[PDB]
From a paper:
SthK also has the same architecture and similar sequence and structure as eukaryotic HCN and CNG channels, but unlike its eukaryotic counterparts, pure SthK protein can be easily produced in large enough quantities for structural and functional work. SthK has a voltage sensing domain, a pore domain, and a cytosolic cyclic nucleotide-binding domain (CNBD) that is connected to the pore via a helical C-linker. Interestingly, a proline is located at the end of the first siphon helix (Pro300 in SthK), which is conserved in HCN and SthK, but not CNG, channels.
Analysis of the major, closed conformation of SthK P300A, revealed that the siphon, where the mutation is located, has a slightly different conformation compared to WT SthK. Interestingly though, the density in the siphon region of SthK P300A appears similar in resolution to the density around it, indicating less heterogeneity than in the WT channel, as one may expect if cis/trans Pro300 was contributing to the flexibility. Overall, the closed states of SthK P300A and WT SthK13 overlay with an RMSD of ~0.7 Å indicating that the structures are similar, but not identical. This displacement is a rigid body movement, that brings the CNBDs in SthK P300A about 1–1.5 Å closer to the membrane compared to their position in WT SthK. The structure of SthK P300A in the closed state reveals a previously undetected conformation of SthK, which we hypothesize is what WT SthK with all-trans Pro300 would look like.
Numbering used by the authors:
A (entry chain A), B (entry chain D), C (entry chain B), D (entry chain C): 9 to 63, 79 to 412
Write the structure that this text describes.
Amino acid sequence: PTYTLVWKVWILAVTLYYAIRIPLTLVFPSLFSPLLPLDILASLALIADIPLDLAPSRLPDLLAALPLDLLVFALHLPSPLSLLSLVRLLKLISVQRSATRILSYRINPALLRLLSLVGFILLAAHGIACGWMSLQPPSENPAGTRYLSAFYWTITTLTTIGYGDITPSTPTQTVYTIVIELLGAAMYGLVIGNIASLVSKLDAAKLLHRERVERVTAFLSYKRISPELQRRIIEYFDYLWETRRGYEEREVLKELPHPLRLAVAMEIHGDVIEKVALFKGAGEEFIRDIILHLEPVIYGPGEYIIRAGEMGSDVYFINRGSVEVLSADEKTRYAILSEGQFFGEMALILRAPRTATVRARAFCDLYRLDKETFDRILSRYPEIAAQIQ
Amino acid sequence: PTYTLVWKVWILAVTLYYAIRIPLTLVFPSLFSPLLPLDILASLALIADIPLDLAPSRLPDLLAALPLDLLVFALHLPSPLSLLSLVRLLKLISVQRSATRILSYRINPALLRLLSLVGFILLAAHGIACGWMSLQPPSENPAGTRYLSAFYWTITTLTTIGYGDITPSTPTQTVYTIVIELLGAAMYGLVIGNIASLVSKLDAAKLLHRERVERVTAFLSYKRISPELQRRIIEYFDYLWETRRGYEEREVLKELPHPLRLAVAMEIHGDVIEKVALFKGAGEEFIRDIILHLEPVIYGPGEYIIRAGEMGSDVYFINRGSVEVLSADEKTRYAILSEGQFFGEMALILRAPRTATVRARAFCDLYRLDKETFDRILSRYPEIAAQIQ
Amino acid sequence: PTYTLVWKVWILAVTLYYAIRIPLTLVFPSLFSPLLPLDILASLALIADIPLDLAPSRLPDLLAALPLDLLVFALHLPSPLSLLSLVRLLKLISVQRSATRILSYRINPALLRLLSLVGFILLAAHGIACGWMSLQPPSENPAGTRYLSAFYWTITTLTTIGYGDITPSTPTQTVYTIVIELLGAAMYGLVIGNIASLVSKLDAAKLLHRERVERVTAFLSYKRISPELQRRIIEYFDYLWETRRGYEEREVLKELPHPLRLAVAMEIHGDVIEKVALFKGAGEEFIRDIILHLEPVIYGPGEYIIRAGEMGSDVYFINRGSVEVLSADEKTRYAILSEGQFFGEMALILRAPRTATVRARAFCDLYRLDKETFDRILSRYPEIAAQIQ
Amino acid sequence: PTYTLVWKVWILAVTLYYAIRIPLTLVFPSLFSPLLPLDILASLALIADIPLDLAPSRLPDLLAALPLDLLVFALHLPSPLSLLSLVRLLKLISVQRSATRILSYRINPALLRLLSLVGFILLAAHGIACGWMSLQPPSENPAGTRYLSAFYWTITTLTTIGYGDITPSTPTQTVYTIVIELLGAAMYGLVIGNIASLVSKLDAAKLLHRERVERVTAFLSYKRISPELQRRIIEYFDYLWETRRGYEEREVLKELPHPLRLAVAMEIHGDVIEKVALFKGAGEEFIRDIILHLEPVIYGPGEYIIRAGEMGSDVYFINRGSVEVLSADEKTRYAILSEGQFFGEMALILRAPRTATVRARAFCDLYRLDKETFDRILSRYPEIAAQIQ
Ligand SMILES: Nc1ncnc2c1ncn2[C@@H]1O[C@@H]2COP(=O)(O)O[C@H]2[C@H]1O
Ligand SMILES: Nc1ncnc2c1ncn2[C@@H]1O[C@@H]2COP(=O)(O)O[C@H]2[C@H]1O
Ligand SMILES: Nc1ncnc2c1ncn2[C@@H]1O[C@@H]2COP(=O)(O)O[C@H]2[C@H]1O
Ligand SMILES: Nc1ncnc2c1ncn2[C@@H]1O[C@@H]2COP(=O)(O)O[C@H]2[C@H]1O
């Protein structure tokens, strides 16, 4: 549903309202004007979200729900006790722990952590500036100019810049300053770390592939291999990057279980299926057993697949590329094949050698049957086995 | 035991006492008041821990135990020789090397390194501030205000902020300042590095899973596959994340040896065990041989497991989900199965085709027997083999 | 082709011209002198590149092509509206997205990202300094001295140094300063992250190898193994690092498909091929079947390969190193073999035990046949099988 | 040899002398006193190392050898031309590229890179401070106090601290300052990156093991397994960490080739070898064939290995731990076995069931024979096969 979503958003806005008012009031008690209605509404939202959640871990919600702030603000309390209203916070923890699940997949987790941290940083800067322009000699100056200098200071401190135009004078100012410096250096170490971890995973494939190619190459040069083969290999890896980004079909489809892998394979070879069982008569238990045995392979341009005098024994189904057939030795082409078709069948149904030569024309992406396996699951079905003659 | 633990804690507190007194005294010799008893107790603790340890590597303990400080403090020594009392340190090395083993597993090692580094940082700041408010023109000012400005300075320096409100005047001040700047830039590089390494390993599974899904998807789109199958795959991966966090059963149980793997499997299928060998009569050497051959598999909602005209030859044991049985083609359901039950048995004990259809209702988590293996270890036990008829 | 390349370079230079003039003019309207021709040429280049691209994603090109700047500059517009000329930017996005593909392989992607980021940084510094020396009390000072102080300021800010020699005075200055501080701390976090990710992948092999050796060693010492064997192992790993950088032949050649792997293997063992089939008569279907079964192995100096009383049954082809033959027990050497040669043949074609002993002399890199496989694919070809007698 | 080593060290010291004198002279021409002998010696060392190297890449050595500095220093040259003496540098590149190989293995490569970078940093700081105290109004002040302030400045700049006590006044000063700021921010990004990469690889095993345990656990809890088995598993992983640091024997010994693996295995089971072939009569071709088939396994305390009514068919050799034998059901122990011994033999040489029960007493580390393999390579040797009766 969405009501829980909009509700959590309302809780977020409420805790923001509190995080921003609480301290600004502790400094400027001239607020708490006929503006308590919003405080009451927010307290009600929190005390009405604590049960929903029920529909250690719940300790923050309990500490945030009770109005430990309305008292201190209504009945004037002194400086060291006027604090403890911040207990109305600690709901930000629940907010983060909720929105890290509501939005746990659609975006990188590191990015989400980074944004949360930045929000936390800015709220803390707002609180720290309030604390600073509290620890200052009282003067007659507008509250919009006392708050600007404080934000300027705490941002030059948290940022590790430190101009030096406005500095501590009294000791307590100095202790506050020390603590803020440490939190800034500790708040600036987290940002950099999250960012580094976020960029160290952007270009993964374009690094894995690069390392794999470097490995292959650096290994071949030790074997003192010709540059032509090196160039063929490099072209192969380029073609394998600019289509599927470097991934191998088998290792991938192995990450899936049997039914989904079968459905994939049956959505791939569907065309071939409507080009084989036409005059055969089988189906639904034979097509589904070989299809998991088809192993892929890629033949570059000009590479020989089948020669006119061998006994390969296998059969090849094309999926993407093209192919040309030729005579044994006179480079005369019978025809040209393309996707969907198939060849290598005779030497399977029949134990004769090959009758022609097969040379590719461009980068193929075809599949093949070992025939030890294909002939093994044919014997098991004797009807088609008789159909082959 | 715990006596060694509390003892190491006492040694830690003692070396802390020394790290904090040693320099503060070197600056303020007005200490060394009738406060030597604590120094004697700590020297005794160190000289009494050096033998326990015995119950290069031991060089620091030897240099820390001898009272090279009590002399210098008792018999007044000049400024360049009043040093060398810090030899009482170097016990922090033993402390770190001990507590990195006492607490080596219950918490992340990087976190522990980070906390140790921060403690080392603060102690060094305390020492550096002492050194600074030594290298200052002598004046009549309280010692609590001379120590605050020094800590403020060295924290603005180590932090890489550098306001500029208090700076070096004399040359030796300037050399001290240079060294502190370098140590700060070298002390601030370690913190950031530890933090980055600590956040680069929080969300591991939620990154491995994400990359695996991106790979699968980006590979399928190249094969021009329908979006329905893509959605089924995504739902599968979601269900596989929100239960076991992305981990595969086989790859995991493979990280264990044979006895623990067997005990696991026998705690899992225990229910099935009390639903099979009832009227059989076997046990303790047959149940324990098949159980290691049960391979898991997951069938999504609506996926066909068994059809009314095939010869699957296998048998399926359910563990978590549910299932429905149906006729061949008229979508009439005989009954509904749930966890603990089993089906697919007839075509195993008997070589007939299937008699019905089996379609899942929700995400199953079931197990299956190949039957090549099951029928192979049945033949080996001829008694049950006759029991099957 | 190259015309598209030089064209994209021209587009890059044009968008640079704009990024550098646009703001410098907004500050110094005394420009827009008889210097509009270059602006017209650049607008034409952009409006003429938008169609080529055609030969969301295209939104930036559309916003950059229309002359939303020529109006504002021709007809004088006020300060808050004189902006929006920067819409002529956003072409840098297309520039980056184009040059990240044009140069996606020849250099590390991280390095490219880093250089792009640095360029973006410097352009932003140029814009920010213009913005700063706009938000300054008007004075009579040369424009080359007002622009230097601004660049100095924004570089001391973006860099997180913050001397403090020139600072904000007015509030709007202060808000600008806050924003620049945040962007600097956010612009300095990206640089460090990219750099860390760029150095964390330089020494990969020299780290993988090191870890593998540490693992092997630390495992052996637990088994209380002699140091001699440890030294032999270390020498082996050194020799395996200083030739092929730690990579194993099989795992590597497995990253290739069958045809390229076959061509590799046939370029390697080519010499052996012209030393075997001389008096045999086979070829093109037997040489090509065993060659994929040759498994490599490395024998250190002094290691026994074959002893005079065993029945190894295998045959060894040498590729790089040398070897010595010897009698059974009297250390008398018959001859010495080197690369290209072969031995171990008799016990293959004949089922007698070995006749001599074979000890290496230096680090060999040889290959061997199991003979279960070699004798299996020989039977399949009965002609040579009769040729062996 | 070592002469080349000491020679490279001399070259290093010479290029250091030059890097430190060259600029300090360019600033203080009052040097070049009767101190030219050292310059001549260093030029000779460089011009005499250029040929040794011979016993693009050599361009730096050629540019460093010719005395492009002795002229400028002898015949007074003006300020913009008095430069180009730094060409005597660029030998540091050869120094780094040499010492990165001389010391490429004994220490982590990242540490070495870091130290090189730090040295480069300090030399650059020395040069930059010279350049700075050149770009200063000439005054009457000692050269040891003009050089201290410059080093202080450039270290507060390179470090990203920036106090602000001494700043640029003139424009050229300001441009120098800008460049130094960028180099510092670019010199401080490299240090942090190297450090992060150096700490991200310290605790590898103690992280891999931790992740593996988290995976196993988090997977079991989903299967709702008892806590007793969980505790047994945790104890197993602890014992497996505190002996061999988490590494598996098979995966490790698989990183070695056949001869070294054989020699390892024959140094391990050597005791067993002198406890088996005593009354047998075999050797050197039977012991060496089974030893590679022994598979390891670990049985925790109290785990049953063999029960008095099964037909395990296998045999177990102990290596480290202990074991107890017992009757079928009355917990009466016949004897107690320890390392070196063996059991499970009868049911191998004979096809009877087991005669007793075997329960471990502590963490064992034993090995076992499948017996399908052991009985297969026994048949091949018929002599011992008759010896078994
Ligand atoms: N004229 C042709 N046009 C297209 N394909 C052919 C032609 N002649 C033979 N082939 C195919 O090429 C294959 C090569 O030899 P096979 O015996 O494997 O079976 C052959 C046929 O499938
Ligand atoms: N009426 C039924 N209720 C539940 N399960 C059934 C029913 N009829 C058949 N089955 C099971 O469904 C299986 C499908 O075909 P099998 O031959 O494998 O064996 C069958 C039985 O185990
Ligand atoms: N005199 C020799 N010179 C070179 N190689 C030899 C000599 N005698 C035997 N060999 C080879 O050494 C091999 C060792 O025993 P094989 O039976 O395997 O076959 C033997 C021959 O190939
Ligand atoms: N009394 C004994 N003391 C020690 N080992 C024994 C004793 N009796 C039997 N065993 C061993 O325990 C083994 C258990 O059954 P096996 O048939 O495998 O062979 C047995 C012997 O090797």
